[model samples]
Target: APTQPFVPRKGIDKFVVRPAPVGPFQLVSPGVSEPSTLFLYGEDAYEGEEAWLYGVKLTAEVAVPTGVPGDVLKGKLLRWPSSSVKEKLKAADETYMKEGVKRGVVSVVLQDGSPEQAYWYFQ
Candidate 1:
């Protein structure tokens, strides 16, 4: 059998994290270099800091497309899977690259199949 494709939810791209700019930074994923780091929204001291971001209010926009489904265009926030800590961080980084729109990801909740999850946010 063919491998299952990484198809996102119908009418939904991916969950994008939006920050309030002043509230506590949401979303925490595994850190590649260090154990982890607190992420924030908007411009930061560094330009390539989008790797350490995640969000609690993970939201996504539904596109106006037809012939998809009839049960309402719903979306779900599935936990990203990974085993190792570095592996988990890399997985989240890949998502940021694809869905980040090149500018940067506001934040994301990274996972490594642990009992507890971390909120990772980037600027």
Candidate 2:
């Protein structure tokens, strides 16, 4: 049997959230799903969710292993000059044609963390 469950929660993508205690939230995107796989690590698993995914009695000797650190990127990336709203973007481009252009940037503060108190946010 496994140590816990995989209860996913809804999360935000526009903003960065502080690391949660457990039961991570699921982040949603505007573009949208393909049987997305979220690997539950050492911590974060709940007793209820684990039992839901893996039965309580399906093991002789099993153990959930430790996981290594991976990069957690927060915030939306503006491909420097990429956008879907062509009407407004076209106006911006017109202005850029006149004035000096500048690359889009985000003023982010990345505190060191697992970035997952609760989820593998969907992109």
Candidate 3:
């Protein structure tokens, strides 16, 4: 069972958000601040019609254990395409979803050749 309802601390403005490149969608606070995992939010559209793109920098520390089972050093880069942009991406690459995950790079700073910390960067 979950330990608690997971209430965020007050006055902890430790998150960063930005728009994604492909879609009018946006990514918010993808797990950069918290130690566990970074998360990215996908907004369907932005500013009515035109697509928007941006990135964020988090002030929190990476929380995953150094030798965690999953890809601790990796962060997910996702694209929630608008109807218009979806078509465009699909046309260019039939398997964009798989490609994006594989291509998306997780930026981390290594203290001793191992990932000591990480952050997300979206294009």
Candidate 4:
């Protein structure tokens, strides 16, 4: 009997969070960190004041070219899991839209899972 060798995904390089300018300041996973005091605004301030926080796990398929040295191409398969809170928020937003409430706040926990090798190929 022999063990299977690990085969890495090709054509992708890395998985990263797409830039979001405004949102809750994720204390657990500092999406982006800065050293200046100006960073302490909005959600950052809220989290700092409350001292309560949550977690979001992000995972995606990544690939790197075998012959191109370090150059890689990547794709994101999923974003986050859905929850009841998210559903209600969506419904409320829809209602508000019908009533002309163009913008408002909707909060939900976003969790991402670790990407396991679904399959691999050499190209």
RMSD of each: 13.4, 18.8, 15.6, 17.4
Q: Write the per-residue lDDT of candidate 2 for residues 46-111, one digit (tens) a residue.
A: 221221111111122212111111223322112212233455445544543333322221112222
Ranking according to lDDT, highest score first = 1, 3, 2, 4
Cα lDDT tens digits, model 3, 1-123, are 312221112111221121244431222233443222222323311222121112232223322112212212223323334344445444423433332331232323222222211222233
TM-score (C-alpha) between model 4 and the true structure: 0.17
Q: Which regions of candidate 1 are displaced past 4 Å?
A: 1-18, 22-83, 99-115, 119-123
Candidate 2 residue pairs in clash (backbone atoms < 3 Å): 4-50, 5-49, 5-50, 9-26, 20-117, 24-118, 25-118
Candidate 1 residue lDDT tens string, 5-119: 2222221122323335343322333244233332323322233222212123223421221211221222223333343555655655665535533322222322321212233
* Model 3, TM vs. native: 0.17
Model 1 local distance difference test score = 0.30
Candidate 4 least-lDDT 10 residues: 49-58
Looking at model 4, residue 28 earns an lDDT score of 28
Residue 11 C-alpha lDDT in model 3: 10
Q: Write the per-residue lDDT of candidate 4 for residues 27-70, one digit (tens) a residue.
A: 12323432111101122133321110112121222111222213
Which residue pairs collide, candidate 3? Answer: 30-39, 31-38, 31-39, 35-62, 35-63
- Model 4 C-alpha lDDT versus the unseen true structure: 0.23
Model 2 CA deviation exceeding 4 Å by range: 1-84, 105-123
Candidate 4 positional error at 94, Å = 2.2
The local distance difference test score of each candidate is 0.30, 0.24, 0.26, 0.23
Assess the local accuracy of residue 41 in candidate 2 as a C-alpha lDDT between 0 and 100.
20
Error (Å) of candidate 3 at residue 42 is 2.7
Alpha carbon lDDT of residue 60, candidate 1? 40
The local lDDT score (0 to 100) that residue 34 gets in candidate 3 is: 26
